Structure 1
């Protein structure tokens, strides 16, 4: 849609930051489109990932971190609030202990911090979606 995918924005995160993403899958759920959101430690795409969030629409969600080039312990969820053929609103909040992921206003996943959120320098949103809105909030000290 409006914003190009893969979408990359330089970013900083701390407690109280919220990342808001509005978009739509590019395929029906029968065809298993993916969505991936990665919080990176540098602008380079090969950099470490403090928070990796990957939706296989209609099947599962996997969350992980990539630290000094290597993937760590995967967290796999079968929770699937996303609806076939529908626009979604994703809200990722930085709490003191974890990221909290809201889908269409409903708490749907959390992921405890493995690396301090202050290590993030970039957010990338990619795979099989179009994007109409992306925002990182910067309202708190």
Structure 2
């Protein structure tokens, strides 16, 4: 297992992929969460270019935190995750948006609000175990 909360320095550009493999810690019935935050600095309270929060079995919430303020919330009811199963997230950094694949198919998209070049850290946390975290070279 990798450390959770998991915090890493990153550098991203168009064409980068952030791969995350993990497993929910508890039954979906109890709504475990997963959160992935693309931050502008190493500090945890720094701004967030992409906030991706899964309410397993319920919904997905996406947003940005700009100058310490949460902006317009984006919601999805797509729930391709499977109770108890390991999942593989691939967050593709496209020219216009982040695209979040689950097990190789895109389910969530978030247009860039902050330039991708401002992202310097990614934190993965909440109710998962983590077996892989990789930023493409």
Structure 1 and Structure 2 fold alike (TM over 0.5): yes
Aligned length: 137
1:85 positional shift: 0.7
1:98 equivalent to 2:105? Answer no
- Secondary structure of the 1:45 match is coil
- Secondary structure of the 2:21 match is strand
Spell out the pairing of 1:12-51 with structure 2 (5 A cutoff).
12-51=11-50
Cα distance between partner residues in 1 of 2:65 and 2:136: 24
Aligned to 1:112: 111
Aligned to 1:66: 65
- Secondary structure of the 2:57 match is coil
**C-alpha RMSD over aligned residues:** 0.4
Cα distance between partner residues in 2 of 1:116 and 1:131: 27
1:5 positional shift: 0.2
Taking structure 2 as the reference length, what is the TM-score of the superposition? Answer: 0.99
- Secondary structure of the 1:118 match is helix
1:136 equivalent to 2:135? Answer yes
